[PDB]
Amino acid sequence: GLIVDTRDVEERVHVMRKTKLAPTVAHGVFNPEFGPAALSNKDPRLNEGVVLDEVIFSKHKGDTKMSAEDKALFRRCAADYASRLHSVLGTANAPLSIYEAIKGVDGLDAMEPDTAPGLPWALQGKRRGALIDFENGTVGPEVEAALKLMEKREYKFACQTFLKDEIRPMEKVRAGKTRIVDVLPVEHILYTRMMIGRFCAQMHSNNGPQIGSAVGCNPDVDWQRFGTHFAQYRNVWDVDYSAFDANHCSDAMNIMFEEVFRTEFGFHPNAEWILKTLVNTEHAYENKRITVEGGMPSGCSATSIINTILNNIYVLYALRRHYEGVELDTYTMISYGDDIVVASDYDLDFEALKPHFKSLGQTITPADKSDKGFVLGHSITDVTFLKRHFHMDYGTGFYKPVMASKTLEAILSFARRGTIQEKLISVAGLAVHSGPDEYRRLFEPFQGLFEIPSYRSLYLRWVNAVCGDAAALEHH
RNA sequence: CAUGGGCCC
RNA sequence: GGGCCCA
Ligand SMILES: O=c1ccn([C@@H]2O[C@H](COP(=O)(O)OP(=O)(O)OP(=O)(O)O)[C@@H](O)[C@H]2O)c(=O)[nH]1
Ligand SMILES: [Mg+2]
Ligand SMILES: [Mg+2]
């Protein structure tokens, strides 16, 4: 992203709330190199010299500009994908009624009833509870006012910045690498779902290598479907982006919308518009009013869908900018936002692709830094998608999401107040794939003070998930 | 603590 | 109507 006119005003929205993640009985047992990212400008852990209001906005290195040469290529790559995509999802992308946009549709969860209302909804001390009724499916006064405004391309707004209170690595938390969230007005999210909600709903229920999207999947069951796929390709790459969602160049974003959400595909005219209102965003941090021209807001509806689409276009635009005669079937991939997994028989050289992604403002890097460079010969059982690996379950011979033990430990070391028991159960369905032994150790610190489900009770549950008949015919 | 999926209720 | 994980 690129800043242009940083300034100050009056109102000072505070979000540096004291961390709400308290150590658990397991913490002192695992001593994870992780901890809640410093949310205060003057946090003890912070290094003597590093600033908060500084590092946080140090993700905007500018907005890479493109040439008429590159633009044309990206647009074509975005057109080819758009064609390939809609040739599956169909052309049924008509707008959704104010009702549908709320209560959601088949393949699209409803809107959050108790979340950040946005702005000025925040300064007016009024939350969604005093703006829209998520039960009958209708908006209130303030909201509808915007609808008639957004339906006329005259809706201005500002994004509210938040300091995500999460568990990050000490090295990152120490350097003050606290991730920030960009909250947009609730009406903006409501209209977005109206313009391209039918799309996302179809995008979700069709996740896979084909449309190259993993949005709307469940690792516990789809890992078997994804595994087999990338299991039959000469090479597999575990690419890594640096501030992916914050480096999308204005050119790429616009051209992407102009080619993917065309009315030609059954989309409502105001589909392209409502999406572009994300390029030049006006973030608001306390008394500051930073203006950015580029990147994607860390809180806009269908944020993952956009990233996934772009991520899909970049891989094409990249490979095509190096070779000639590259097609969407020249390689296979899938992604959920920035995290991506590519594969192909051709010994593609991603190393020589780095410069090409740079034209778009992205910086690709291998997830296996141990090699310091993109090498070949790697299979799917070597990469990691969504903090999950791809291991062959000795039991049912299926593929199962296996998170790193160190990652799980850090997860079982922190939690909100009076939410332990809950997390313990949720996370339990994640460690089951770490084998019986690990599942026991990981939950050892909570034995005698909480209810820990048996490794088997969760295992069977999983089997009946990956394949209901797998556990059924297991009796015959 | 937003966006979205998924899971746990 | 909560919580959790990934993004
Ligand atoms: O609060 C949040 C949570 C998630 N996200 C978004 O979700 C995605 C998850 O991505 P990452 O945030 O995982 O990569 P990183 O910055 O840790 O990169 P390096 O330090 O290693 O270079 C990012 O690409 C980010 O845009 C936010 O912007 N804010
Ligand atoms: Mg990354
Ligand atoms: Mg990865």
The ligand whose atoms approach the alpha carbon of A338 most closely is 1
Separation in Å: C2 C1' and A227 CA: 34
Q: Which nucleotides of B are covered by protein (CB under 7 A)?
A: 1-9
| Other CB atoms within 10 A of residue A412 CB | 27
Same domain for A436 and A338: no
Please check whether strand B approaches the CB of A218 to within 7 Å.
yes
Choosing from A302, A334, A365, the residue where a domain stops is A302
Same domain, A326 and A356: yes
Do A15 and A87 share a domain, yes or no? yes
What radius of gyration do chain A's Cα atoms show?
A: 23
**Rounded (10°) angle between helices A303-320 and A250-260:** 100
Residue A163 to residue A317: CA distance in whole angstroms:
34
| Together in a domain, A233 and A328 | yes
Rounded, the Å distance between the CA of A231 and C1' of B7 is 26
Backbone angles phi, psi at A333, to 5 degrees: -160, 175
A165 touches strand B (CB under 7 A): yes
> Which of A266, A287, A302 finishes a domain?
A302
Closest residue by C-alpha to C1' distance, nucleotide B8: A426
Q: How many CB atoms lie within 10 A of CB A238?
A: 19
Check whether residue A74 and residue A201 sit in a common domain: yes
**A465/A460 Cα distance (integer angstroms):** 9
Measured distance CA(A175)–CA(A178) in Å, rounded: 9
Give the other-Cβ count within 10 Å of A437's Cβ: 9
Closest CA to ligand 1's atom 10: A338
- Give the nucleotide at minimum CA-to-C1' distance from A163: B1
Specify whether A126 is located in the same domain as A224: no
The structure tokens listed for A218 are: 């469940």
CA of A22, C1' of B4: distance in angstroms:
27
A160 vs A182: CA distance, rounded Å: 5
Statement to judge: residues A176 and A261 lie in one domain: yes
User: Residue A10 CA to B5 C1' — how many Å?
Assistant: 38
Strand pairing report for A132-133 and A339-344: unpaired
Using CA atoms, how far apart are residues A219 and A173, in angstroms rounded to an integer? 28
Which residue lies nearest B7, CA-to-C1' measured? Answer: A426
**C-alpha to C-alpha distance for A147 and A438, rounded to whole angstroms:** 52
Strands A280-284 and A291-293: antiparallel
How many folded domains does chain A comprise?
Answer: 3
- Cα distance between residue A410 and residue A175, in whole Å: 19
3-state secondary structure A151-210: CCCCCCCCEEEEECCCEEEHHHHHCCCCCEEEECCHHHHHHHHHHHHHHHHHHHCCCECC
Give the 3-state secondary structure of chain A.
Answer: CCECCCCECCCCCCCCCCCCCEECCCHHHHCCCEEECCCCCCCCCCCECECHHHHCCCCCCCCCCCCHHHHHHHHHHHHHHHHHHHHHHCCCCCCCCCCHHHHCECCECCCCCCCCCCCCCCCCCCCHHHCEECCCCEECHHHHHHHHHHCCCCCCCCEEEEECCCEEEHHHHHCCCCCEEEECCHHHHHHHHHHHHHHHHHHHCCCECCCCECCCCCHHHHHHHHHHHHCCCCEEECEECCCHHHCCCHHHHHHHHHHHCCHHHCCCCHHHHHHHCCCEEEEEECCECCEEECCCCCCCCCHHHHHHHHHHHHHHHHHHCCCCCCCCCCCEEEEECCEEEEEECCCCCHHHHHHHHHCCCCCCEECCHHHCCCCCCCCCCCCCCCCCEEEECCCCCCEEEECCHHHHHHHCCEECCCCHHHHHHHHHHHHHHHHHHHHHHHCHHHECCECCCCHHHHHHHHHHHHCHHHHHHHHC
Kindly state whether residues A430 and A458 are assigned to the same domain: yes
10 Å CB burial of residue A457 (0-12, 13-18, 19+) is: exposed
Per the listing, tokens 């799917």 go with A380
Domain of A223, CATH number, reads 3.30.70.270
Resolution stated for this PDB structure, in Å: 3.0
Of A344, A374, A403, at which residue does a domain stop?
A: A403
Q: Which residues have C-beta within 8 Å of that of residue A297, sequence separation ≥ 6?
A: A159, A182, A184, A278, A281, A303
Token pair, residue A476, equals 């015959």
Residue type, A49: G
Q: If you measure from the C-alpha of residue A340 to the centroid of ligand 3, how many angstroms do you get, rounded to a whole number?
A: 6
Nearest to A313 by CA among A369, A359, A375: A359
> Quick check: A67 CB within 7 A of strand B?
no
Ligand 1 pocket, Cβ-based, cut-off 6 angstroms:
A 164, 179, 181, 242-246, 298, 337-338
First to last CA, chain A: 59
Residue nearest to atom 19 of ligand 1 (CA): A242
For residue A403, the one-letter residue type is M
Distance between CA atoms of A237 and A376, rounded to whole angstroms? 8
Residue whose structure tokens are 């009985």: A25
Q: Do A328 and A200 have their domain in common?
A: no
Do A439 and A447 form a contact (C-beta atoms < 8 A)? no
Q: Are residues A339 and A458 both part of a single domain?
A: no
Spatial neighbors of A283 by CB under 8 A, at least 6 apart, are A158, A159, A160, A161, A182, A289, A290, A291, A292
- Judge if A142 and A195 occupy the same domain: yes
User: Among A238, A217, A180, which residue's Cα sits nearest to residue A57?
Assistant: A180
CATH number at residue A440: 1.20.960.20
A298 CA closest ligand 1 atom index: 28
Residues A124 and A88 in one domain: yes
Q: For residues A218 and A8, what is the distance between their CA atoms, to the nearest angstrom? A: 44
Distance in angstroms (rounded) separating the CA atoms of residues A334 and A312 = 8
The torsion angles phi and psi of A119, rounded to 5 degrees, stand at -140, 145
How many CB atoms neighbour CB A390 within 10 A? 23
Closest nucleotide over all strands to A420 (CA to C1') = C3
The residue behind tokens 């300091």 is A163
Domain enclosing residue A430, as ranges: 404-476
A42: left (phi over 0), alpha (psi -120 to 50) or beta: beta
The tokens for A153 are 């391309």
CA A214 / ligand 3 centre spacing (Å): 13
